[PDB]
Amino acid sequence: SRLIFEHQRRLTPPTTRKGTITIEPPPQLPRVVPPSLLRRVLPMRTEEVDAERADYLRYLSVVRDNVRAHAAEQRAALEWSHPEPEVLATIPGTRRQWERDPRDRDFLVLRAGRHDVPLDAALKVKDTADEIDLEPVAHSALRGLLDVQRTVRDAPTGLDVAKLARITVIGEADEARAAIRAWIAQAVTWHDPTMLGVALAAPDLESGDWSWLKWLPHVDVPNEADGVGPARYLTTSTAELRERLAPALALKHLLVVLDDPDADPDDIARLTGVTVIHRTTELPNREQYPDPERPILRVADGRIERWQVWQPCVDVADAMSAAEAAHIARRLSRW
Amino acid sequence: MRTEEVDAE
Secondary structure, eight states, rough: OOOOOOOOOOOOOOOOOOOOOEEEEOOOOOOOOOOOOGGOOOOOOHHHHHHHHHHHHHHHHHHHHHHHHHHHHHHHHHHHHHHOTTGGGTTTTTTTTTTTTSSSSSEEEEEEEEEEOOOSOOOOOOOOOOOOOOOHHHHHHHHTTTTTTTSEEEEEOOOOOTTTTTEEEEEEEEHHHHHHHHHHHHHHHOTTTTTTTEEEEEOSSSSSSSSTTTTTTSOSSSSOTTTTSSSSOBBSSSHHHHHHHHOOOOEEEEEEEOSSSSSOOSSSOOSOOEEEOBBBBSSSOOSSSSSSSSOOEOOOOOOOOOOOOOOOOOOOOOOOHHHHHHHHHHHHTOO | OOOOHHTTT
């Protein structure tokens, strides 16, 4: 029925030299004596301090170039490991499909869009002064540097799921199912179908809606045919999906999604990593400062605005379409 | 040492 895949090694994109770039503090406002016309009318004065200013600014330029190289490495890696939700149509073929392993820094991380990643490198200066006054035209430059070259511009974000255990989106219907299908495909595509599992419950499953999990062998079961479908956990009842997963519930990671806002949300959990996803109708208003785990997510036009006290947390969201996911499943069912 | 020096301190 299906072909065979062999565990060819993963390729390595050049990682980050995650060190501690250090910057020398500027000079210390050298005291300038009065010009004194008497000894200035013949035809440690400004010339020397200007020379020193120029030297420090040159040094600063060099450091800026180096940190930009580091930023280039970082964006290169992050683009390599979370491509845009169209290239993934071509990935199921080549030797990079199950290229994610539990030893690798990117594991069970699900891309959702592009915004400012804070440049994991250090950027620490060794300031040792007790409010001594530093030269104005150097300190100004260093300060104006340490704020714009510290955060990478729009970069592939990460909605990691290895330490969330619950995701609950809020907002319009299909805008939600978009980001959901998006990162759920991005998840299944990179990791061995023998390593992580997914579950579904929805009323109109086979209508161009959640049907598309048909050809999915990530939703599979061990030792069961179900006639045509791998496991076809794809259902409409909640506790029924639980029972279909009750033996599978026990590490193969589990990803249970629920297109139903009602029908007893939070009824399996609340375990040790098995993640639940549930689209909700409406929000809490005074949540007790939601834990970074099991958080709240609102879907704007192109934002995925987190819930904190609105901290958009994504400025351009990654959205998928239904038919695209359909063609994804179709292509991937081959190997 | 110029007067204008200490006056600056």
